[PDB]
Write a protein that binds this ligand. Structure first.
Ligand SMILES: [Ca+2]
Ligand SMILES: [Ca+2]
Length: 279
């Protein structure tokens, strides 16, 4: 299948070179996989989700996304127009308030919730969790991420937007999960993207068009935007049977475009998420 005039990030992950505008992908499109978006919520009524999104848990007064961040990330995972895995099932877990903030205790609870909840869902091709959030180092937050991964969920997390070594941020610094940095449309490391030896992979993160609340769209930037590209790619690859939740991050790194990025500090991987599609 081919989506013409796609958002640049979708085109990038299906090409060996930058500057293309078509997103090439297998028609299976992540059908049968499930992705939990652990964030500010999801506006599940957005036409772009086609009835494939639903809120399953909130830690606040409402399950509504009053911010937009969660809806944007969910859109990059699996909306019709802006998504990597266009037929996946999306589950929203609201651990961040409508200002985009949340206590570590709540974020940890949300992770432990997903590890349990997945046992009540029909996700025959596998389960992914996308965490576009983080803050300063916490061994408890790292441990929760490690538990979620251990339970059989592919965990993708943002490296963070401090232009610093991700070793000092959580859950970015947990080695057992998939830590995602951001790149721009000219194959540069995004100027805000964290780096360091703990990064596993880069995905598109600057000027990413996706869904927004009020049934709208907008373009924003961050490692928060790169993370759902990788989460969506994982769901896509699991549906194709190419990899499993335990090994998806490694498989994605193994099959990545290598050496394409500029402004990568020595010691940081130069690997860009790639779906290896061949018609
Ligand atoms: Ca290349
Ligand atoms: Ca890792």
């Amino acid at each position: 299948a081919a989506q013409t005039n796609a958002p640049w990030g979708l085109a990038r992950i299906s090409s060996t070179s930058p500057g293309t505008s078509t997103y090439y992908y297998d028609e299976s499109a992540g059908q049968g996989s499930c992705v939990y978006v652990i964030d500010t919520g999801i506006e599940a009524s957005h036409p772009e989700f086609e009835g494939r999104a639903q809120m399953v848990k909130t830690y606040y007064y409402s399950s509504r996304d009053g911010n937009g961040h969660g809806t944007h990330c969910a859109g990059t995972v699996g909306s019709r127009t802006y998504g990597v895995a266009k037929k996946t099932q999306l589950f929203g877990v609201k651990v961040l308030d409508d200002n985009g903030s949340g206590q570590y205790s709540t974020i940890i609870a949300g992770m432990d919730f997903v590890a349990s909840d997945k046992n009540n869902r029909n996700c025959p091709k596998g389960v992914v969790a996308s965490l576009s959030l983080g803050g300063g180092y916490s061994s408890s937050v790292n441990s929760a991420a490690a538990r979620l991964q251990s339970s059989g969920v592919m965990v993708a997390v943002a490296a963070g937007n401090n232009n610093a070594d991700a070793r000092n941020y959580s859950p970015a610094s947990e080695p057992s999960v998939c830590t995602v940095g951001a790149s721009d449309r000219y194959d540069r490391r995004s100027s805000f993207s964290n780096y360091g030896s703990v990064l596993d992979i880069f995905g598109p993160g600057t000027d990413i068009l996706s869904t927004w609340i009020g049934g709208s769209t907008r373009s924003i930037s961050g490692t928060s935007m790169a993370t759902p590209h990788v989460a969506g790619l994982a769901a896509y690859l699991m549906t194709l049977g190419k990899t499993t939740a335990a090994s998806a991050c490694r498989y994605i790194a193994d099959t990545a475009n290598k050496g394409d990025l500029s402004n990568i500090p020595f010691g940081t991987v130069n690997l860009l998420a790639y779906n290896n599609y061949q018609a």
